[PDB]
């Protein structure tokens, strides 16, 4: 990703294997999370975006940080080194399994319990683990890099201390009564 991490990673469940751009073609192994493509002009064009590229752009919210890619990527680039330190595995692999485990499987509509499309499983997975890092680095001594790093490794395997895992089982438990 930065001449440091390889892309020899797989996906646990096939439900997201065809919808995640990891190493399928030669255009996804990109040297930077900075690609200026047009990924929102046709439906299902965002799948062609690199996985880390999509994750980086989700760290650009709350107004005062709008349209600042360089500031956003620096947080991610110095976080995947922390994830490797705390897991001794591939940081890309840690992100990939974290998405699968934190992905919701059933939501509700105004209530009727309904399942979630595989893309919305990916889209909501990113929206969850970034919110926890954004809120937990607010008015805190700890930096956003470790804040993002600890959430991914916690939400990776099974930990319920992460914000992503709490919300993933929050909707399923609510949908468990909305059958």
């Amino acid at each position: 990703l930065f001449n440091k991490w390889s892309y020899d990673v797989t996906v646990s469940d096939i439900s997201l294997k065809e919808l995640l751009a990891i190493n399928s073609k030669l255009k996804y192994q990109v040297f930077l999370p900075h690609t200026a493509g047009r990924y929102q002009i046709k439906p299902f064009r965002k799948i062609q975006c690199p996985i880390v590229e999509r994750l980086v752009c989700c760290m650009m919210q709350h107004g005062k940080n709008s349209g600042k890619k360089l500031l956003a990527m620096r947080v991610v680039e110095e976080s995947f080194e922390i994830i490797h330190l705390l897991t001794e595995k591939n940081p890309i692999q840690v992100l990939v399994d974290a998405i699968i485990n934190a992905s919701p499987r059933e939501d509700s509509t105004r209530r009727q319990a309904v399942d979630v499309s595989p893309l919305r499983r990916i889209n909501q997975a990113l929206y969850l683990m970034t919110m926890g890092c954004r809120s937990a680095a607010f008015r805190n001594s700890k930096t956003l890099a470790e804040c993002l790093a600890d959430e991914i490794v916690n939400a990776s395997k099974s930990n319920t201390a992460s914000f992503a895992i709490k919300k993933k089982e929050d909707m399923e438990r609510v949908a468990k009564s909305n059958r």
């Binding site: 620096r74 110095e78 080194e81 922390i82 330190l85 930096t143 890099a145």
Partner: peptide
Amino acid sequence: VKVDNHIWIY
């Protein structure tokens, strides 16, 4: 690991 002007991670 890296020591830039933004973080000191070791």
